[PDB]
Amino acid sequence: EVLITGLRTRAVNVPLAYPVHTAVGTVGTAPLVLIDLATSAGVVGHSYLFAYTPVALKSLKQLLDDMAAMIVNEPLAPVSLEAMLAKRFCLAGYTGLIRMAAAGIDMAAWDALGKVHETPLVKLLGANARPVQAYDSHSLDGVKLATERAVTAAELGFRAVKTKIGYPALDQDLAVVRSIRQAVGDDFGIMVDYNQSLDVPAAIKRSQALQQEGVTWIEEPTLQHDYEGHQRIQSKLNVPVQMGENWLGPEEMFKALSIGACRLAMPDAMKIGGVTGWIRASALAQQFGIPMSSHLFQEISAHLLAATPTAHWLERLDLAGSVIEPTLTFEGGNAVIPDLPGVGIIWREKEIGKYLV
Amino acid sequence: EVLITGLRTRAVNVPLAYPVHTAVGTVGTAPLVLIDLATSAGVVGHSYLFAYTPVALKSLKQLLDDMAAMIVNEPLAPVSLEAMLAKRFCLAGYTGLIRMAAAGIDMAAWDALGKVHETPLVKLLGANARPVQAYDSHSLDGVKLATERAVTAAELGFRAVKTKIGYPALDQDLAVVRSIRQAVGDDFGIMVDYNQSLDVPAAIKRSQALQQEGVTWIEEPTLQHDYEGHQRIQSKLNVPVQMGENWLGPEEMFKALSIGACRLAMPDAMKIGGVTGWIRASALAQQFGIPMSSHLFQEISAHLLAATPTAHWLERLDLAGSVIEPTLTFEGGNAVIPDLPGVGIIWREKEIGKYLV
Amino acid sequence: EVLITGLRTRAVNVPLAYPVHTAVGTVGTAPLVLIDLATSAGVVGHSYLFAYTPVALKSLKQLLDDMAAMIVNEPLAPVSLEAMLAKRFCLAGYTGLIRMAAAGIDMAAWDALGKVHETPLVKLLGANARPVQAYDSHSLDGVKLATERAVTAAELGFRAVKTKIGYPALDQDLAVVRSIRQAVGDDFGIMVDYNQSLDVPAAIKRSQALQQEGVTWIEEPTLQHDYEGHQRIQSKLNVPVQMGENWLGPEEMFKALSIGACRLAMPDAMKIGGVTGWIRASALAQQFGIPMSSHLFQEISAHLLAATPTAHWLERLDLAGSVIEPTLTFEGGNAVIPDLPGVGIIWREKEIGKYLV
Amino acid sequence: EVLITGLRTRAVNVPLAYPVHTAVGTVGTAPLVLIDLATSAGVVGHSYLFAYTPVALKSLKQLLDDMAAMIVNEPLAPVSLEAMLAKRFCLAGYTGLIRMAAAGIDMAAWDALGKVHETPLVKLLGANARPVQAYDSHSLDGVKLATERAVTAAELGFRAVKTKIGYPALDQDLAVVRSIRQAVGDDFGIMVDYNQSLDVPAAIKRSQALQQEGVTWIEEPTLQHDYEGHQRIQSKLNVPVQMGENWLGPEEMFKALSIGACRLAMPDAMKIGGVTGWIRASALAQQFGIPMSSHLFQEISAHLLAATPTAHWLERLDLAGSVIEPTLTFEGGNAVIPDLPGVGIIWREKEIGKYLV
Ligand SMILES: C[C@@](O)(C(=O)O)c1ccccc1
Ligand SMILES: C[C@@](O)(C(=O)O)c1ccccc1
Ligand SMILES: C[C@@](O)(C(=O)O)c1ccccc1
Ligand SMILES: C[C@@](O)(C(=O)O)c1ccccc1
Ligand SMILES: [Mg+2]
Ligand SMILES: [Mg+2]
Ligand SMILES: [Mg+2]
Ligand SMILES: [Mg+2]
């Protein structure tokens, strides 16, 4: 009855006002693939994917354009579509870029379902829209720029910031944390992200120094696939270890949570498998007693976290603000869901043309 | 001193004389990406990648063409190159198609190193070339075609065949196995591959029936990422459970072997990370006491298994025979390594032009 | 094609400028067995073994002279040779002095392979030569001599020293550490080695006092074969426990790492099985997330660590400097690999004659 | 008061009437080192060591001759001597040939203690001499010679034989077992020894076939250091897995028994550390509920097993019968301890001269 009738993708490389500097490199632009999923009902679902590096951008678009053939004329039923794509990519490996592509389709298909039923996505999922507390996410900025951006964030109403660390010496890490505490006072949340840059001995040593400074969480201290090494770092800390942005699918989260790798989780809506993957991740987090935050994709994440029983923080990191209307607002440090059908993504069509690859 | 000076890729879609039918679909053609890695020494390394479905072919080529920029002018040092690519794809996710691309570069770079030193790859790795026992790999062919191809294989000298199973009823699975035993006698090896098609209860029930028929191994009875479910099936069997073709990198093998998912392993040279990933996988298999076979890539696998302490079987499944010279020969059911520098892959240039995508 | 044609060994007992004093005894001279492995290609591989005590020197030479018969006329293929010697010493026990002898042959055979191909060993193994940070290793020297040698080491550019401890009273241990920190300042690395001299209760008590002084690592606090006791000491510490110099073969390391005995590893190139044993140990250390350092054998270890993914520190302890040319240089506290075929060991033939046993 | 005053060793290579053929090689002669330990009391202790291969014979003698210096003028107190040698070989590695040498001294020192006190060793250890059931140990002899030697053994009164297996095909293994059962009837014990020749899958498959034939135990099915692999084979069998001949010291037995590698143990008096190592091994076996047999050294083992709470079988395999008087007798399949001071070893001095190396 409602069928998918087409899929269109556009690759843009959008400039970021502040380049996201991390201990392992800087993301200077946002390579995005914008997706339009057309339906027989005359509504169009929308989502975008984040390619991380321009090196993977054209490849991800090509893959989605070659996948269009298998979903056109399929019913608009995201849960049924996901099971079919899992099965078709059986042998190839339903992970990495293939999984990320399948999640962009899922996300657009749920946006289209909410437009067919004229309802906000959070309401379609059975929950009320509520304000979600947000922290402002900045990068490995050195003492002065990370302190300047942190003062700006408390002035816009945010109650927590995330800074990037993992400098050559532990002392540079603590300098940054201390200068931020100095400026924002003891009330404020300071989250720190190591971006997989340390080995386990080094991470135990640096994290116990940071724990004495009062940080909110320590994020991905070592290689992300090393769940056992994260459990070993976590076992020596009172402060929570946070991870999850790099889990591809609920099945990688299930393996990390099973061995107790972390006390907090932050799935990425694209890598976890879209809305379908998020509902499953959310059920796991509830049973393992894990507070759950989001990573990127703030527009759909404000909807998904209002439906997440152990919802914890939304990450504000605006990667697509240039090509979409600002329907998501932040008020007093909280994201406010727009009262729009679906997810509330509206393309700024003439900006897109400027950034086209 | 020896530098990489260029990378060229060509995507072909080659016809297979017998389409590889599996319980989850048929691979009717081989989508391959042929790689030429040029060096300052005037030698060219060669490898190919297998894309599994044509849907992923152009995307994988595009990715390799966009990656060329980061390895041109780097020293021809595969172990150092791999650590650098692992680090650059840190945030994106060093798995799936990205990992597969990086492995094609590794494999071509080791072929080029062996050509610089005028030595067969097995000798460069410090071992003697030896004949490696091979089994012939056929598909979900129904009773009559799988029995016909099995008689042909014993006539060419092979001592074991792999058939695909996972039919609607257990009885169809046993019919195929029985008709093959009937024709080849009790001496012959019959391996069976379920290609992830069963759930754990179903796999315990079918595998104990097959075990009473005397099969060599039962391969991937359930979803490949489910290592715990494979351990649960394995715990109820005397016959070995075989898996490993879908592990991306030695770190996924390490996780499966740690929980005792299988009694046999068969890494895929491309998914395990190339020659660099194979040497690491081989060290793990030796310590866990796991006999190690290969999956696809018979040309480089004959070299890698002669250097593998618990080497077990080579899988004969010729996906690129149309576009490369037959330097790998099978004699009395054993692969014989060619006495050629590197890996011994020589393009049949006018065939390639016929299959170009 | 390249065959081993002879093996010659010479036992020397070389004077050490500073006798290596440990909590369980002093190594006053270096009992070494120098090995020359002749090949049909007209190149000669070189290695030496360290006998620890003169009591074991003539026995180790005799063993190698009696083993010559089984490797002469075998192909120069170290990985194939190792599997054959493992098999021949099956019943006797492939450990202790037999394993150490087999490793001297491995090391000489890889040096000869690199000379056949005119390439540095690190390049033959597929990696780039890079500077490796080194620490200077001194002994149980008492407060004043260990402080004097530590000032000398920071003056030669080293950024860390290893001192020996395990005095009758904990207070003597801390005095030594404190006097060194006093002299070199808070930036410097101080590693401490107990040389198996404590029982587990005693080691928990002394290590938590040393941890409050800021040492880099605590090395072999109790009996080396007691992996469980090391795990019990490690579980009570933030500082890493270091061990590994006494593991014979990758299979003993595999057992220690499996139960989590230590957070750092330092295999000995001879006891771990030579270059072949090192590549396997290196794959294990990477999967268990263990930073890996070396023990003795600085010349070949500078090559092996440049090829080791979790490479951590090189131990400078020059046992054979009197009978080999100084091709290994230390610059700004880092070992610099010589640009010589193989390993770069060149006998000083008239010195050898002075030390001959 | 009683001091050790000298140590003398003689290396002989004695012909064996039946060469001990195993799946990994044949022991055609017995390379032995005969030890004479002189004391201030005017008594001389005696023991011999078994070198397994002539390749290790001269090296083991040399080592003992170089160790003489550290025990001459020490009190004749084996337990105190062992702790001192453990400590002196701290750094070198108290295992392999060094451990085997130290055990030859222990065994001679306990023989000398029993001669000082004019008492049989079993009585000095606090137990009564009792007959110990013995099995006759033969080799990989093929169907006809292993059946001929098994009939001879039942005729001399033995109630069990050990045969060697591990032929190219399982069918050859069962042929040998069946032909022996045929000849000796269903009452007789048939033990089988694989001598580490199988991998774990292969060992599960062959052992369940042998278990259906009724063998007494399956001995060392896989590599001896692989305790986990033995536990995995054992977990699939009703018949006991037997091992222990290759444990060097009670600390290796402790590790194997801790993970449940076997249901039966057979320490070797030399590799376990002599009489001192045997008393410790015996305490471990009792607590883990492990029936304990011996391996080789029948003369001292008849004494040690009469003092072993879970004593099970003595292995008859006469390696030194040519150079020692037959004071150990077998009567109705049981070893009968001689009523002689110490261990009852008396050199046949003119035979020794014939076999001298
Ligand atoms: C810093 C990061 O790890 C995060 O948590 O926000 C991140 C990684 C990659 C791209 C954007 C953001
Ligand atoms: C059947 C298979 O699982 C195998 O093991 O060969 C296989 C899967 C996919 C492509 C080729 C072969
Ligand atoms: C002190 C030591 O344990 C080390 O780590 O260097 C060592 C032990 C034995 C000989 C040389 C060095
Ligand atoms: C066969 C054997 O394993 C045994 O158990 O007796 C053995 C091994 C080596 C020498 C003699 C005997
Ligand atoms: Mg992050
Ligand atoms: Mg398969
Ligand atoms: Mg040390
Ligand atoms: Mg035996």
Curated annotation (Swiss-Prot), chains A, B, C, D:
Q: Which reaction does it catalyse?
A: (S)-mandelate = (R)-mandelate
Give the pathway annotation. Aromatic compound metabolism; (R)-mandelate degradation; benzoate from (R)-mandelate: step 1/4
Binding annotation for substrate:
E315
Cross-referenced PROSITE patterns, in alphabetical order? Answer: MR_MLE_1, MR_MLE_2
Would I find Magnesium among this entry's keywords? yes
How does the cofactor attach, per the note?
Divalent metal ions. Magnesium seems to be the preferred ion.
Transmembrane stretches in the record are none
Task: Give the Gene Ontology MF terms in alphabetical order.
Answer: hydro-lyase activity; magnesium ion binding; mandelate racemase activity
Query: What InterPro entries would the database entry show?
Result: Enolase-like_C_sf (IPR036849), Enolase-like_N (IPR029017), Enolase_C-like (IPR029065), Mandel_Rmase/mucon_lact_enz_CS (IPR018110), Mandelate_racemase (IPR015654), Mandelate_racemase_C (IPR013342), Mandelate_racemase_N_dom (IPR013341), RHMD-like (IPR046945)
The record ties this protein, via Pfam families, to:
MR_MLE_C (PF13378), MR_MLE_N (PF02746)
Q: Where is the active site?
A: K164 (proton acceptor), H295 (proton acceptor)
Q: Which UniProt keywords apply?
A: Isomerase, Magnesium, Mandelate pathway, Metal-binding
> Keyword DNA repair on this protein?
no
Q: How does it assemble?
A: Homooctamer.
Q: Which family does it belong to?
A: Belongs to the mandelate racemase/muconate lactonizing enzyme family.
Q: What is this protein called?
A: Mandelate racemase
Question: What's the source species for this entry?
Answer: Pseudomonas putida (Arthrobacter siderocapsulatus)
